Amino acid sequence: ILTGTPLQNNLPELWALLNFVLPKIFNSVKSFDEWFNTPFDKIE
Amino acid sequence: DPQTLITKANKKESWRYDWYQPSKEKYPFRYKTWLRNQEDEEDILDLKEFDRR
Amino acid sequence: FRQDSILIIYPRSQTTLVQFGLNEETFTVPELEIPTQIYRTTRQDGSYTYHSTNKDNKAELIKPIQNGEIIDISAFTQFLRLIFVSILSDRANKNQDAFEAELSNIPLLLITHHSWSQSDLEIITQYVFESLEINNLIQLPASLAATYSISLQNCCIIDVGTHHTDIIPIVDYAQLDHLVSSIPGGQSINDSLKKLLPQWDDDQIESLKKSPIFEVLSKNSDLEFNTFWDEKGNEIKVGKQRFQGCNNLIKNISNRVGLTLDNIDDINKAKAVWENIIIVGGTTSISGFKEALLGQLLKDHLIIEPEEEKSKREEEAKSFVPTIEYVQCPTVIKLAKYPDYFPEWKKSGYSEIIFLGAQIVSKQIFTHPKDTFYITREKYNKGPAALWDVQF
Amino acid sequence: GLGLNLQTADTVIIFDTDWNPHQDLQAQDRAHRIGQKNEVRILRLITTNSVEEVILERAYKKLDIDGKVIQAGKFDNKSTSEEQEALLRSLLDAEEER
Amino acid sequence: TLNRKCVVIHNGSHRTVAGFSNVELPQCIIPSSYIKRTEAEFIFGTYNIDAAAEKRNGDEVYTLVDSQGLPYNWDALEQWRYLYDTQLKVSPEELPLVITPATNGKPDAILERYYELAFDKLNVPVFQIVIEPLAIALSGKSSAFVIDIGASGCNVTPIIDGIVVKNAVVRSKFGGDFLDFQVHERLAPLIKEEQKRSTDVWYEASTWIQQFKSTLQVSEKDLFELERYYKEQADIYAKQQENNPLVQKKNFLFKPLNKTLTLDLKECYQFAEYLFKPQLISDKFSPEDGLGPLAKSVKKAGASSPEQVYSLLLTNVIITGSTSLIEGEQRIIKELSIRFPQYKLTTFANQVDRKIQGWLGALTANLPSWSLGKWYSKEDYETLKRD
Amino acid sequence: LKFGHRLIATHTNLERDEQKRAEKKAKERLQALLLDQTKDTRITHLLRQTNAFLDYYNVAHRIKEDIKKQPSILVGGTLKDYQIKGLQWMVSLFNNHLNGILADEMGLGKTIQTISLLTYLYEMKNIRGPYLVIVPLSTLSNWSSEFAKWAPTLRTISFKGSPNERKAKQAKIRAGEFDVVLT
Ligand SMILES: Nc1ncnc2c1ncn2[C@@H]1O[C@H](COP(=O)(O)OP(=O)(O)O)[C@@H](O)[C@H]1O
Ligand code: BEF
Ligand SMILES: [Mg+2]
Numbered sequence A: 001i002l003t004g005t006p007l008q009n010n011l012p013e014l015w016a017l018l019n020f021v022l023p024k025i026f027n028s029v030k031s032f033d034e035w036f037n038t039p040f041d042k043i044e
Numbered sequence B: 001d002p003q004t005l006i007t008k009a010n011k012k013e014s015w016r017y018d019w020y021q022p023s024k025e026k027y028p029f030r031y032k033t034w035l036r037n038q039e040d041e042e043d044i045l046d047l048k049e050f051d052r053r
Numbered sequence C: 001f002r003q004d005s006i007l008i009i010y011p012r013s014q015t016t017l018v019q020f021g022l023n024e025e026t027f028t029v030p031e032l033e034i035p036t037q038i039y040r041t042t043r044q045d046g047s048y049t050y051h052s053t054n055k056d057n058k059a060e061l062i063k064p065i066q067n068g069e070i071i072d073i074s075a076f077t078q079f080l081r082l083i084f085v086s087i088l089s090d091r092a093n094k095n096q097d098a099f100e101a102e103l104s105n106i107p108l109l110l111i112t113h114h115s116w117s118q119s120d121l122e123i124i125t126q127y128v129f130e131s132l133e134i135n136n137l138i139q140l141p142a143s144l145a146a147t148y149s150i151s152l153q154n155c156c157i158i159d160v161g162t163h164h165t166d167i168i169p170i171v172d173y174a175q176l177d178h179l180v181s182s183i184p185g186g187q188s189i190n191d192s193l194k195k196l197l198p199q200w201d202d203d204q205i206e207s208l209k210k211s212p213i214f215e216v217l218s219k220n221s222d223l224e225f226n227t228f229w230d231e232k233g234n235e236i237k238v239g240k241q242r243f244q245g246c247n248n249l250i251k252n253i254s255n256r257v258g259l260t261l262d263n264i265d266d267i268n269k270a271k272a273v274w275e276n277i278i279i280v281g282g283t284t285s286i287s288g289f290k291e292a293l294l295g296q297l298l299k300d301h302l303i304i305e306p307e308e309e310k311s312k313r314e315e316e317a318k319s320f321v322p323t324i325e326y327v328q329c330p331t332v333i334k335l336a337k338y339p340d341y342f343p344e345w346k347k348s349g350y351s352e353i354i355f356l357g358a359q360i361v362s363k364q365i366f367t368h369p370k371d372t373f374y375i376t377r378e379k380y381n382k383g384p385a386a387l388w389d390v391q392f
Numbered sequence D: 001g002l003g004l005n006l007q008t009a010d011t012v013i014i015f016d017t018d019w020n021p022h023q024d025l026q027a028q029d030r031a032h033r034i035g036q037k038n039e040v041r042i043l044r045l046i047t048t049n050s051v052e053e054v055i056l057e058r059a060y061k062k063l064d065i066d067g068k069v070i071q072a073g074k075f076d077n078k079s080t081s082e083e084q085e086a087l088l089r090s091l092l093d094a095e096e097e098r
Numbered sequence E: 001t002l003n004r005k006c007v008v009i010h011n012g013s014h015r016t017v018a019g020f021s022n023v024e025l026p027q028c029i030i031p032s033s034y035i036k037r038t039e040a041e042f043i044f045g046t047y048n049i050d051a052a053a054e055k056r057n058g059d060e061v062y063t064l065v066d067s068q069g070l071p072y073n074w075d076a077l078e079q080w081r082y083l084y085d086t087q088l089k090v091s092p093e094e095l096p097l098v099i100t101p102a103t104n105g106k107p108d109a110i111l112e113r114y115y116e117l118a119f120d121k122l123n124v125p126v127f128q129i130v131i132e133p134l135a136i137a138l139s140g141k142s143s144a145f146v147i148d149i150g151a152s153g154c155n156v157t158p159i160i161d162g163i164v165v166k167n168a169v170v171r172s173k174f175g176g177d178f179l180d181f182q183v184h185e186r187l188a189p190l191i192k193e194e195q196k197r198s199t200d201v202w203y204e205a206s207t208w209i210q211q212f213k214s215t216l217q218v219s220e221k222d223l224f225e226l227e228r229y230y231k232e233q234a235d236i237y238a239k240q241q242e243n244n245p246l247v248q249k250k251n252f253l254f255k256p257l258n259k260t261l262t263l264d265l266k267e268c269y270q271f272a273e274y275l276f277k278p279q280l281i282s283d284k285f286s287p288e289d290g291l292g293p294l295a296k297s298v299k300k301a302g303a304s305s306p307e308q309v310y311s312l313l314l315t316n317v318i319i320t321g322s323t324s325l326i327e328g329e330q331r332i333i334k335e336l337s338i339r340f341p342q343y344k345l346t347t348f349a350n351q352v353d354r355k356i357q358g359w360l361g362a363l364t365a366n367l368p369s370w371s372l373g374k375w376y377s378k379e380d381y382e383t384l385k386r387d
Numbered sequence F: 001l002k003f004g005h006r007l008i009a010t011h012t013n014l015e016r017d018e019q020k021r022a023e024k025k026a027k028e029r030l031q032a033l034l035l036d037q038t039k040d041t042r043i044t045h046l047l048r049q050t051n052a053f054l055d056y057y058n059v060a061h062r063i064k065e066d067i068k069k070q071p072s073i074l075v076g077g078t079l080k081d082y083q084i085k086g087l088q089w090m091v092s093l094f095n096n097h098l099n100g101i102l103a104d105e106m107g108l109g110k111t112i113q114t115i116s117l118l119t120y121l122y123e124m125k126n127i128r129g130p131y132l133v134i135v136p137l138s139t140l141s142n143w144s145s146e147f148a149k150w151a152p153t154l155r156t157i158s159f160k161g162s163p164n165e166r167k168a169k170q171a172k173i174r175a176g177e178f179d180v181v182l183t
Helices: A014-021 B003-008 C073-093 C118-131 C143-146 C186-196 C202-209 C246-261 C269-274 C288-302 C306-317 C343-345 C354-366 D021-026 D050-068 D082-098 E082-085 E110-121 E133-140 E176-186 E200-208 E209-213 E223-241 E265-276 E297-304 E306-314 E330-337 E356-362 E378-386 F002-029 F037-050 F083-097 F110-125 F141-149 F162-172
Strands: B014-020 B030-037 C007-011 C015-020 C031-034 C039-041 C048-051 C057-060 C107-112 C136-141 C153-162 C165-169 C181-183 C228-230 C235-238 C278-282 D012-015 D040-044 E006-011 E015-020 E026-031 E032-036 E041-042 E061-063 E096-099 E127-129 E146-148 E155-159 E250-254 E259-264 E318-322 E347-349 F131-133 F180-182
Touching: B003 C073, B003 C181, B030 C007, C007 C354, C015 C073, C015 C354, C015 E096, C031 E015, C039 C073, C039 C228, C073 C118, C107 C118, C107 C354, C118 C136, C118 C181, C118 F180, C136 E127, C143 C165, C143 C278, C143 C354, C153 C246, C153 C269, C165 C246, C181 C246, C186 C202, C186 C246, C202 C228, C202 C235, C228 E250, C246 C269, C278 F180, C343 F141, C354 F002, D082 E146, E006 E356, E015 E356, E026 E082, E026 E318, E026 F037, E061 E200, E096 E110, E096 E318, E096 F083, E110 E127, E133 E146, E133 E155, E133 E318, E146 E306, E155 E297, E155 F083, E176 E200, E176 E209, E176 E265, E200 E209, E200 F180, E250 E265, E259 E265, E265 E297, E265 E330, E318 E330, F083 F110, F110 F141, F141 F180
Parallel strands: C007 C107, C107 C136, C153 C278, D012 D040, E006 E096, E096 E127, E146 E318, E318 E347, F131 F180
Antiparallel strands: B014 B030, C007 C015, C015 C031, C039 C048, C039 C057, C153 C165, C165 C181, C228 C235, E006 E015, E015 E026, E032 E041, E032 E061, E146 E155, E250 E259
16 A cells, blocks of 8 residues: 555554555454554653 | 164165166166165164273 | 264274264264174074174174275174164163154264275165164265365375275365275384384284374484383383384375376366375374375475476576476375364374264254255155265 | 646645645645755645634644654654654654644 | 166276266276286286386286277276276176267177177176267267367267268377377487387376376467467567567476476477377378368268258367367367368367266266167177077 | 355354354463563464565565665666665565555655566566556556656556546457556
8 A cells, every 4th residue: 555644643444554454453353442542641 | 672772763765776677668688776665675782882081 | 953863983994983972062082982893693594683792602703894895784784783773772771862862863974985885885775774764864985074074175085094095086075986096004004113123013013003102204203212111011112113114104105196196187186185185094193104104295296396407407596596397297295284173183183083074064964954965764765876866 | 635746846835724634744745856946835824813723723733643653653664763762752842842 | 867777888999987877977997908917917907007117027008999999808808897896896787887989880799799798798787888979979969070089099970960970980090099109209318218018108108108198288270380370479579679489398207217308388289280290200191190181071971961061060069088188179170160161160078077078978877768778688689699 | 065165164163163262261261370462473473474375674574685776677767765675675575475555755756666566576577467556546647657658568557537438448458468457
């Protein structure tokens, strides 16, 4: 996949990014919804 | 009795391997085939002995 | 059908594996292992009463099957009686309502061999529906019951019992009758064991044949001598012959598999069978027999730019290595895979995996309405001509 | 946004003001290219007392969200190890400037 | 069909193929030859190869069946006992029999010998003799133009409304066994080696010559025409830039040497060229002996309206045979569409099952009437025994 | 064939019933008498992607290759360090049979690296056959113009506009005699 930029800043389709490109994480699709909490006490 | 267990089991024709003469009437030859038997046509081991365990 | 009603029987060259009642989560090892044997009292009127024990020593121990083949069809149908009736009486004692549950309708799944004749299986169906009165019957071949253990479509079944070796090509879940070649069995493994261990007996060399230290080379190997234990618990040591013995049969099967699979006018199915070499039987608990059989196949029949010519054009390449392009079929020789998702079969081994695919086929077809693969009672109302109607 | 590959373009002006920031930065690099002989200047024409500055406010709001993803995706070229923490402190102060 | 279990046997010039009617596969495919191991021991059976892998002195793979499709060693063919007991494991006296090469009407004898072989030698209680190229047309066509490139040669038989055009049945010499001699002849410097030897020659025809045969080719046009055309193509590709398909190596791995036997595409073409052009191997064989003008079997079928025969044959072409499973049918389409372009060659062929297509047609046995074919009673022998 | 492939599905059931036995048995056992499972097991899954699909810089790019020359069929294109590194990392992704995302900014030769993809790997392998390239409708001919000037001997098939003109092409190249379909 050629692109000048990745997906939207919220990035929920990082799955759909990684699913069409890679056979990596299509088994458990509901895995990283708790682990997409990184983009969304500022230090801690 | 083995035959009593057998008739107690799996619940109906019989069939035979016989010379048929086929019809055209009948051919001057004959031939073997599995023909339909019509209506009018030992001992036990206990198991768990040969059981691999 | 009920899997508790399911009876699966594999008579092999010495022993008959029987399982009544599937384990139904993962399939079990066939619990019952009779010898393939039935005593026949020749009652003095010429009638024959058939027993499991030597009845008053007028009984003769008739093996119905050695070398896989039916060697007494009436004694085999009465060994079907001896096993079947025993399942009926044992579930009449242990369960006693199984004649309405497990023995109400037994879908009899009998494992057949390539050397069982057409009249053999027809008399089997006749005795099964008229004298055993079994309304539902699969005569599942040993090759298909091996290949369905992971529904393999093209493979080679090498039934190495203790006595005989079948080489059976399977293409599209079907056996080539004209290419099945049976060469002798772990007695050929025992035979080159006796060639290499002359000081031993058949019990010592057969216990080596069922020893853990039995391999073939193509650590036990770094040890020159290894110690296993006899049937009486006597420690026996063995030199390099525990890496041998199977190797003579390995070369015999290897040349026979090559002459079997290279004579095909279809150049492509040969390779697909060539890469799914399956070796089964009660002997084939021997380690390395299948491995050095594969290595000897690659030694005898692998088509490649050979090490003289591939080395020569390695040197022509160093002047990235190309290969001289050959036209023949056996260019890749491999074995097939065993289902590791059966812990009862992972634990109790896959030397008799013909019973495993028979168990898988029994949970498939019998728990299905599909009588395209088993004769019904009404289908007997074409008989064993409907045995020709219910094949896979 | 995806129409042309130009090495001679110079000046960029945006009126719609980035409903999608990835759409704005996609159309942003059409001026500077391999072999650019001009000097690029970018203007966002925004009127005071209107709603288009709020989308321009929300421009660098959304540009900071993928700053932890796609501007954290920038040092992942040759699997760098120290270039992440340099961009973790330097881009943080640029996010502190806004 | 009717309640019958007939025995279906195809006896080719090299292969004896046997099974029953109720099994659509043969129980065995052994040779119609034998390694007469030397006692005389007529070793039938393919693997029983391994005896000829001994290449033993006295072992002599004589054929039973010559290149006409008729057996010349009939009591060693009575192999029939070997079939029924060692392969079929049944009494022939139980079961009916279907046995499969066309002729001009003279040997319609061999049936008497089959009256020997099915009533006297084996006592098969009834036997049906079917025509093998007509059986290939059966397995559901009524009329055909059957070319069997078997082991015996290119056997051309026209068939019009089920009848055999007797004057036009032509069988060539050049098929499997002549190409066994040819592959043994041309790869002879590369195998470095160069009936009784049939234990050398038939054994090599079982091991490596067939391995060069199922892996030989026929050019889809004439190889001289394809050769000039591909040389013109390669000259175009060379002169435009400043590759020929025929200069590429079809190397053979001669497993009794494990050696590269580089024959090219044209080289493997040239063997099966001798089936269409046997003037390239010997002067005593015309292009008429080749399969193209063999056209002549169409024209001799024109005398049984001749253009109606041409319509039926050249729109109902049938391809079969062992040596026809060598790649290259398109040679037949090109070579007879230049001798008969008038009716476009709509050909039929079993493409696999082709080498045992006479067996499958004899198996089609499974006719719904015993009156559809002549089934010989023992009384039919007794009628043929009179006058 | 219906039955034999029924058992293929049934073997998947007997595996997955064992897998739903065992993974639940693993999830019971591995935490009774965070996401670092995804570190080591996806490194081995990269080995499944290389061999069975057909440090992260080393275990994925294990087939190492670095050629700073352009393809000979790439004619008239500028060679800097981006499309050398962009090629032979993707060639390392090509040799390891891996997909990826070219996450570059812009102007880093998306046409240059893809031409150098097909013209270099194919030069050696000489396949350059039925390969699919799909670009947006805004930039179609520019890729095709760069498929003319930057590389010869790679044919291109387009798909645009009214359906009448497609009937001439897609019935002529119905059998698929091309190097690239640019759709
Ligand atoms: N070595 C070079 N010399 C001259 N121009 C170049 C060179 N490399 C790239 N370019 C320019 O880059 C453009 C192609 O970039 P493009 O494929 O659009 O990148 P992306 O797809 O990543 O946006 C061409 O118009 C070309 O002028
Ligand atoms: F896609 Be960018 F304008 F090269
Ligand atoms: Mg682009």
